[PDB]
Amino acid sequence: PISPIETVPVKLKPGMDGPKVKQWPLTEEKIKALVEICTEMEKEGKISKIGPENPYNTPVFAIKTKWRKLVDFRELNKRTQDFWEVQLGIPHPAGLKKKKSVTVLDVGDAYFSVPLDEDFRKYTAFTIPSINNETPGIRYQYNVLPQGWKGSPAIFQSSMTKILEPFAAQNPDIVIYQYMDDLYVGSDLEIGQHRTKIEELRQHLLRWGLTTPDKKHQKEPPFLWMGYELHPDKWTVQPIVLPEKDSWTVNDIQKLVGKLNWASQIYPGIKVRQLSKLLRGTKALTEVIPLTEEAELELAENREILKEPVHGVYYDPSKDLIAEIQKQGQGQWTYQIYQEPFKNLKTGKYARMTNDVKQLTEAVQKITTESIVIWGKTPKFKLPIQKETWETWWTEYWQATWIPEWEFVNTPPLVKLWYQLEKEPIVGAETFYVDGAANRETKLGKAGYVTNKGRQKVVPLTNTTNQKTELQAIYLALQDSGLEVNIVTDSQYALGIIQAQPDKSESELVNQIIEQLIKKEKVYLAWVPAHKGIGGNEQVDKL
Amino acid sequence: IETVPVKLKPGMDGPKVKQWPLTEEKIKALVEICTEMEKEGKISKIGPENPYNTPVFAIKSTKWRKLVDFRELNKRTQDFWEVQLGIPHPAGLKKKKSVTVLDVGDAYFSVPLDEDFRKYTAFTIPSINNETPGIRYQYNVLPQGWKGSPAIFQSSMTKILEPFKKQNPDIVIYQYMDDLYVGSDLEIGQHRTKIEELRQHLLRWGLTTPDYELHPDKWTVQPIVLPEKDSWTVNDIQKLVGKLNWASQIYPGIKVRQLSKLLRGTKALTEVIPLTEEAELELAENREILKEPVHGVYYDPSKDLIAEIQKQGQGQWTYQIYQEPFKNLKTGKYARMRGAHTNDVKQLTEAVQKITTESIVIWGKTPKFKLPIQKETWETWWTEYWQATWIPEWEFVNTPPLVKLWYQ
Ligand SMILES: CCC(=O)N(C)CCOc1cc(Cl)ccc1Oc1cccn2cc(C#N)cc12
Ligand SMILES: [Mg+2]
């Protein structure tokens, strides 16, 4: 019940007054069950009865083998100061250590067990109607953390934390995790000692006014906690079920791709590429979207890896931490986090929002951040790239980039750079003076070149853009050239794309250019100011 | 001692910046530091009724220092430390032949902080895996890193430095945050002596100081240099014209038409075109405009300073500090000379700190950096080589430069 805990002082947001909300009378049958419960928790000191001296007020409702009392504190919540933010996010099972025993304890009636700051109790007042509605109303306030109030979770937390401290000191061999209204207590003491200490905790708590489950009612493993299966030596996601439907709604696609990523912390190889390409189409809310063909293969592959159940181990800090990365295709990567070879701590995927290597770097970041969060260190990495490849790319990349200690793993699809541009123009190679263009309104375009040997081309283009033709120009010079070619363009856009050494794209143009560049033996690409009058006479022909 | 009351800019609420997660090694270091500091009154544990927060980090000799990032709280109290208690910036510090930087942040830790202000200095030591709520402190004394601390303490500082200033009327002394910059035109050896005098003098008055030798004589806008070469090619002319054209955005007096006419006929890139006199005069006429400095280039103190850094390869970084595009107030270069000892993020971080130190000396303000690095990467590894007490503001670029040699 209400505890000898010291209250946390609360005040209202600056220059605000307490709620003075309206109370429209309700069912006479309701008004009955309300007072039956309302004066049964007054006798327990959770509420009191005050006169009309206080002007604030809030509304109260009923809901249902019995009834239950509810107070929409929305108007008060908007008016009370902000607090420390109740912890955002959850401990990941991958980052717990195997303890010989773990007991779960849920505190009964938590918020009602903690006193509410005295000089802020006036702002919790409500009125129970007198049926006749002209008959007078009985006024109550709260003496404890009201249900669903803004301050309740955060004050409750700090009361619990404080109450734990005296026991945490007498017993440094046990480990209490806090989560909302639960306590999770592990220990590596023989099951007799551990069961003795659990009862020591319950009694401790009970003397602070926090009821808690007896050994008879202490939950038994595996534990069904926050969508996980917590076995005393293994963890897994709870059973995940994917529907076989004919039609699919926007919402139905949202709920599916969620249950899949969820599954991907521990089921390796899961993909969501084509499945989500669909929702990205429009912001439709409940429109029906035809399952596309590629998506269908993805869902079939996901269904296959989900058919068998997969488990992860927990963390042992004495054994180092490893992360391994696989490329999957079309900008999809998978990785595993483990300490020994036959069970993973957890798994996951990265996706491209680009060069094959850049993406890898971004994935090593994603993992690195996640490791720091979950375990407090970074992994050593096993990576599908030759050290000489990496050293070449970063030394020449315009961003600074960091690569924690890593090792090469000769497990394809290896990650490679597919072509490199020449640093200086090629002697004994034809030089191409490309350009391109189009008309905003007309949407027709022209691309061509003019080489030093006097060769010249122009190709008409429909449904093109000043930028899409500037890349067509380059593709023309690659189609019509020997194994060594010098190309010259006035388009920074096109120079930018090619210099980025992209490995693939959705733009099929760029893919063809890539297959040309991988085919060529030596290409030097060079940039000159547009409309400056040096060999750019090729813009006249395209113009 | 009485507490200087600190009001915030009206309509501003205190900082609410989420705390980054940290390696276990650094959490452990922070818990150590704070247990000590709480023991000495410097900070106190606070409850949930305090909703503010300010990130904390751990940096480094062979010992861990705490470093609080008060960037948000500083902007939210700017009147207090810039308008109300402002510390004027000496325009002659940049002209000294030598400037040593002295850490004096330890002076603050004795001075109490206004009781009604402490709530906004909240910070949190995080926990691994979210296993526990987080340990919450707030400061009871002027905190290192806050801009109000030095402003509050300048009275005491002006007094403590009076005997030294009278004895050494030519030595300049500026206080930015937790550091004194002392410039002299003495011989390096005299300078280091005068500095140990000031250290001893500060020690005689109860100010501890532990244990960068900057030289703002070589600090200007460095000039853009065309490549000099014995022979010139079709391609060379083409790089050369491109560089000159971009400079036109800076010196509109770049006269180059006798070069465009140079190779008018589509020629191979390797064609070694010869030199025209009419052309070569447009090249010497242009190299001269390159020696002179810009026109209109002044420091507007109403505006913010902007730094852009480019990676150059082989351990070389270039930088420009400007306020408006193309009107450079200063440009320069950095080079870390330790291979098999230095890596990219170390260089960018040392670069960032040298540019800030320069900027404090020249202007008493810090620039906002345009960093060439992935946001998440930088938010993970900057503390590993951060050695300064302040933190400038930053943002990240994703568009690369056109020609890096355009700046060196
Ligand atoms: C089934 C348990 C098991 O046996 N192991 C080896 C996992 C380690 O879990 C803990 C370790 C320590 Cl040191 C203390 C407490 C531990 O329990 C939990 C930690 C986090 C969240 N929780 C939610 C529930 C439920 N419902 C229980 C736990
Ligand atoms: Mg913090």
The one-character DSSP state at A193 is H
Spatial distance between the Cα atoms of B400 and B311, rounded to a whole number of angstroms: 10
- Both structure tokens of A431: 């030089």
CB contact under 8 A, B270 and A92: no
Spatial distance between the Cα atoms of A484 and A105, rounded to a whole number of angstroms: 73
CA of B123 to the centre of ligand 2 (A): 4
- Both structure tokens of A14: 């600056």
Mutation for testing the B interface, residue in A165, A402, A532 having most B CBs under 10 Å = A402
Decide the pairing of beta strands A380-383 and A406-408.
parallel
**Residue B217 among known ligand-binding residues:** no
**Residue A435 among known ligand-binding residues:** yes
Answer yes or no: are the C-beta atoms of B89 and B363 closer than 8 Å.
yes
From the options 3.90.1150.10, 3.30.70.270, 2.30.110.10, 3.40.50.150, give the CATH code of A222-315: 3.30.70.270
Tally of CA atoms within 13 A in the half-sphere of A460 that contains its CB? 4
**Residue A541 among known ligand-binding residues:** yes
> Which residue type does A140 have?
Y
Query: Phi and psi (nearest 5°) for B295?
Result: -105, 145
Question: What stretch(es) of chain A map to CATH 3.10.10.10?
Answer: 1-86+112-152
CA of A121 to the centre of ligand 1 (A): 37
Q: Which domains does chain B possess?
A: 5-91+117-157 (3.10.10.10), 92-116+158-213 (3.30.70.270), 214-299 (3.30.70.270), 300-407 (3.30.70.270)
Query: Phi and psi (nearest 5°) for A334?
Result: -130, 155
Spatial distance between the Cα atoms of B181 and B174, rounded to a whole number of angstroms: 5
> Which residue type does A222 have?
P
Question: What stretch(es) of chain A map to CATH 3.30.420.10?
Answer: 419-543
Place of tokens 């680009």: A354
SS3 of residue A416 by DSSP = coil
Spatial distance between the Cα atoms of A356 and A352, rounded to a whole number of angstroms: 10
- Both structure tokens of B96: 């000294």
- Burial class for A3, CB neighbours closer than 10 Å (0-12, 13-18, 19+): middle
The technique by which this structure was obtained is: X-ray
- Both structure tokens of B267: 């020629």
Spatial distance between the Cα atoms of A138 and A131, rounded to a whole number of angstroms: 12
- Both structure tokens of A35: 């007072």
* Sign of the alpha-carbon torsion through A22, A28, A29, A33: positive
The domain made up of A419-543 has a fold known as Nucleotidyltransferase; domain 5 (3.30.420)
- CB-nearest partner of B373 from A95, A157, A400: A400
Spatial distance between the Cα atoms of B99 and B181, rounded to a whole number of angstroms: 6
Residues A450-457: contacts with CB within 8 Å, 24+ apart? A450/A537, A450/A538, A450/A541, A450/B266, A451/A477, A451/B266, A452/B266, A452/B267, A452/B268, A452/B271, A455/A430, A455/A480, A456/A541
- The alpha-carbon gap from B242 to the nearest alpha carbon of chain A, in Å, equals 6
- Chain B residues with CB under 8 Å of A368 CB are 380
Q: Which helix (H) or strand (E) holds A357?
A: helix A356-375
Ligand nearest to the CA of A176: 1
Q: A87-111+153-221, which class in CATH?
A: alpha beta
| Pick from B342, B335, B341, B349: nearest CA to B380 | B349
DSSP letters of A151-177? SHHHHHHHHHHHHHHHHHHH-TTEEEE
Cα B196-B197-B200 angle, rounded to 5 deg? 85
SS3 of residue A301 by DSSP = helix
Q: Is the peptide bond before A413 cis (omega within 30 degrees of 0)?
A: yes
| Pick from A37, A206, A19: nearest CA to A123 | A19
- Both structure tokens of A303: 């269904």
- Both structure tokens of A103: 């007991």
Burial A444-461 (b: 16+ CB within 10 A, else e): ebbbbbbbbeeeebebeb
- Both structure tokens of A107: 């505190």
CB contact under 8 A, B133 and A83: no
Sheet holding A522-527, edge to edge: A430-433, A484-489, A522-527
Residues B149-152: contacts with CB within 8 Å, 24+ apart? B149/B108, B149/B111, B149/B177, B149/B178, B150/B81, B150/B87, B150/B108, B150/B175, B150/B176, B150/B177, B150/B178, B151/B80, B151/B81, B151/B84, B151/B85, B151/B86, B151/B87, B152/B4, B152/B85, B152/B111
Question: What stretch(es) of chain A map to CATH 3.30.70.270?
Answer: 87-111+153-221, 222-315, 316-418
HEC string for chain B: CCCCCCCCCCCCCCCECCCCCCCHHHHHHHHHHHHHHHHCCCEEECCCCCCCECCEEEECCCCCEEEECCHHHHHHCHHHHHHHCCCCCCCCHHHCCEEEEEECHHHHHHCECCCCCHHHHCEEECCHHHCCCCEEEEECECCCCCCHHHHHHHHHHHHHCHHHHHHCCCCEEEEECCEEEEEECCCHHHHHHHHHHHHHHHHHCCCCCCCCCECHHHCCECCCCCCCCCCCCHHHHHHHHHHHHHHCCCCCCCCCCCCCCCCCCCCCCCCCCCCCHHHHHHHHHHHHHHHCCCCCCCCCCCCCCEEEEEECCCCEEEEEEECCCCCEEEEEEEECCCCCCCCHHHHHHHHHHHHHHHHHHHHCCCCEEEECECHHHHHHHHHHCCCCCCCCCEEECCCCCCCHHHCC
Q: Is the peptide bond before A91 cis (omega within 30 degrees of 0)?
A: no
Spatial distance between the Cα atoms of A256 and A276, rounded to a whole number of angstroms: 10
Sheet holding A456-462, edge to edge: A435-438, A444-450, A456-462
- Burial class for A338, CB neighbours closer than 10 Å (0-12, 13-18, 19+): buried
Spatial distance between the Cα atoms of B30 and A376, rounded to a whole number of angstroms: 14
HEC string for A458-489: EEEEECCCHHHHHHHHHHHHHHCCCCEEEEEE
Question: Which residues is B194 bridged to in the sheet?
Answer: none
Query: Phi and psi (nearest 5°) for A317?
Result: -65, -20
Distance, first Cα to last Cα, chain B: 55
- Chain A residues with CB under 8 Å of B262 CB are 534
Ligand 1 residue neighbourhood (C-beta within 6 Å): A 91, 96-99, 102, 104, 175, 177, 184-186, 221, 223, 225, 230, 232, 314
- Both structure tokens of A42: 């007054």
Superfamily name and number for A1-86+112-152: HIV Type 1 Reverse Transcriptase, subunit A, domain 1 (3.10.10.10)
Chain-centroid distance of CA B259 in Å reads 41
Q: Which helix (H) or strand (E) holds A32?
A: helix A28-42
Spatial distance between the Cα atoms of A39 and A25, rounded to a whole number of angstroms: 19
> Which residue type does A231 have?
H
Spatial distance between the Cα atoms of A277 and A255, rounded to a whole number of angstroms: 15
From the options 3.30.300.10, 3.30.70.270, 3.40.190.10, 3.30.930.10, give the CATH code of A316-418: 3.30.70.270
| Pick from A194, A264, A268, A259: nearest CA to A232 | A194
Spatial distance between the Cα atoms of B56 and B145, rounded to a whole number of angstroms: 11
- Chain A residues with CB under 8 Å of B266 CB are 431, 433, 450-452, 535, 537-538
The one-character DSSP state at A431 is E
Spatial distance between the Cα atoms of A466 and B341, rounded to a whole number of angstroms: 47
